[PDB]
């Protein structure tokens, strides 16, 4: 049978995300001015399905949550597309037992994936830190996560 | 075998909102998904809306959104629907069903293998 | 969302072959190589006679079989009787995480 | 074509375990008297191979991880089994978007599921808290991971 | 079609250590497996190690642990593999192999489709 | 961990069919449903033949089939040609994460 393509996203489901050189900025505006690891060849994988893809090799005004395109934030002229998730979002160094930590600690609120794309080729892969606490970068950072509801 | 066990049936009148619960004997929601499926007398089978109890984000049809709750437990084998503001076309046998589907993801591929046995539900005076 | 359309009203004589298509718009109703069929008799629940496209449950007669041809799911019934004077639906997954019913048909028997 | 056994692990693999009605404690030995949720009747799923049990129903002496048993420590006479995890768990309310964090919410460190087996048919999952974020108990929790290397 | 290019043949004295890396053109890692296989002249094959780039979690042979070390760079396709306190005996060519399976798990059902072209690795004097 | 035991030596004259067996001990080789076979010819680097089970490579010749019986699992080639004198070893998985690679067998031509 034909493999759910990782361009169709339901809730509940696993993302695994990839983020090979990931480097630190200070802030970012998709998430409200707060440090974010990004990387230019993130690799998404929906882990129940096995399905994967390069982050830019996406068209991500064509990717679909529960049947309903991914909410979209328009900041400074750069348009962003919103993962929501379940929980928090877990990632860590590849291949060591170091793992990061997000902005969000101390608060219950769940994390999200945000993917700034260019309408071509070129997607940049955002998740949320506190601090360096990874390495400045380049880091291969290895994130986990669980598709939360869509947006309301 | 599993058996799906409905409550009893009810009578309400316009306006007001009903609560049919499933049971499950036999086993444990697992990671199975439970669907509740409607039949008005002499019409066809309509789809209200599904849940995965794992998951528990429960999904509804176009119809019945901002109208029907789907909430499923754990603790007791027990799977829940709600509807609310009940006209006189809500008056249907409403069926408890499971998503013979042990992969809650792969939701695609499914079928509704035990069926309850069906509460029915008249909204008159 | 547009349900799945049926043929109301199919019959046929004891011993003949008889089929009901599925018919749908959209892909939103997803792959026709997918789709379960149900067989309700008067007065009981609906019970599942094939699944998954072409699989059948245990226990159900070997007379029921299921093709499916492009926008369009097909439940084959070999060999009418009396016992297949029953309603028969189809259903399928949506994009949106649903499940959409056929429109439901009636079996006679000439 | 047979499945692989959720008795046996490997580097790498994603857990899915649910803590239906989930109960805080203060503190518990295997992770250092800490406060932690425990669950009488959790599940445990391996994501990418869809096989389930129920914590209880597993004999815990047989879990292998990389071929290997899992890592035991006696704590004042009750025997706890460790699953290492590759970063830290994550855990939320189950069906809500209300998150909860770990112990070591600003440390580096990774974190790891902890069962106590009776031996019999009685096991308790153990899952890492910092307080009662997620409410005194009973509670639906839902924890995400992914499987590190073996202990050594 | 993806290639696995190795480097160079060397010639390292005993007691020395080798690092012998393989270069993926075609494509990228993605989600395979990176596998060392090493044949003595006139010998069998023999599996050194593996590693699952994503995983990043090497797994060795018994014969050679505590002796080698598998690495993979995603940024620059290649993987890597180090021998150290190198013997008479390690004298072999030295393959790069992919795991040819899509999933990183399931990894059991595997299989090795494309190899390298082989590094000679020669430990005299 | 013991490798897999396989018959060294094997020989056959032109036309006929040649068995070599890969036979191992204790869970922990995985299945045999679930072994690779490969073939190396004189100077070049091993190549794929039969993977997982049964299953042949584009562009493999149809003449070597997999089979599988308890704890031994079988390569069979069918009409022996100049070709097919090389060496061919067997792959399993382990339960540790390794993998174990046969003893080999050199196939000859009468």
Not at chain 1, 45 to 73: M, P
Not at chain 1, 94 to 110: E, M, P, V
Not at chain 3, 74 to 92: F, K, N, P, V
Request: glycine share 10%; net charge neutral; proline share 5%.
């Amino acid at each position: 049978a034909p493999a759910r393509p990782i361009t169709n996203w339901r809730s509940g489901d696993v993302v695994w995300v990839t983020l090979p050189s990931a480097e630190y900025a200070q802030s970012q505006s998709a998430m409200g001015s707060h440090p974010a690891y990004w990387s230019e060849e993130a690799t998404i994988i929906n882990v129940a399905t096995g399905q994967r893809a390069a982050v830019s090799s996406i068209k991500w005004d064509q990717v679909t949550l529960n049947g309903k395109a991914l909410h979209k934030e328009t900041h400074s002229g750069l348009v962003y597309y919103q993962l929501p998730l379940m929980g928090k979002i877990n990632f860590w160094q590849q291949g060591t037992t170091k793992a990061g930590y997000t902005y969000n600690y101390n608060t219950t609120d769940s994390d999200s994936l945000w993917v700034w794309w260019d309408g071509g080729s070129k997607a940049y892969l955002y998740i949320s830190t506190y601090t360096t606490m990874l390495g400045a970068g380049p880091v291969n950072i290895t994130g986990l996560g669980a598709v939360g509801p869509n947006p309301v | 075998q599993v058996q799906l066990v409905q409550s009893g049936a009810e009578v309400k009148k316009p306006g007001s909102s009903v609560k049919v619960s499933c049971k499950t004997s036999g086993g444990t929601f697992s990671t199975y998904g439970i669907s509740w499926v409607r039949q008005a007398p002499g019409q066809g089978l309509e789809w209200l809306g599904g849940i995965i109890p794992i998951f528990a984000t429960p999904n509804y049809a176009q119809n019945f959104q901002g109208r029907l709750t789907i909430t499923a437990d754990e603790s007791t084998s027990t799977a829940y629907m709600e509807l609310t503001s009940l006209r006189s076309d809500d008056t249907a046998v409403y069926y408890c069903a499971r998503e013979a589907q042990p992969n809650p993801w792969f939701r695609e591929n499914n079928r509704f293998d035990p069926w309850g046995q069906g509460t029915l539900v008249t909204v008159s005076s | 969302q547009s349900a799945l359309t049926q043929p109301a009203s199919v019959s046929g004589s004891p011993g003949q072959s008889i089929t009901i298509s599925c018919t749908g718009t959209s892909s939103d109703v997803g792959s026709y190589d997918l789709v379960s069929w149900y067989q309700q008799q008067p007065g009981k629940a609906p019970k599942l006679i094939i699944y998954e496209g072409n699989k059948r449950p245990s226990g159900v007669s070997h007379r029921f079989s299921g093709s499916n041809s492009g926008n369009t799911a097909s439940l084959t019934i070999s060999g009418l009787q009396a016992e297949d004077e029953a309603d028969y639906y189809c259903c399928s997954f949506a994009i949106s995480v649903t499940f959409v019913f056929g429109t439901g048909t009636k079996v006679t028997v000439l």
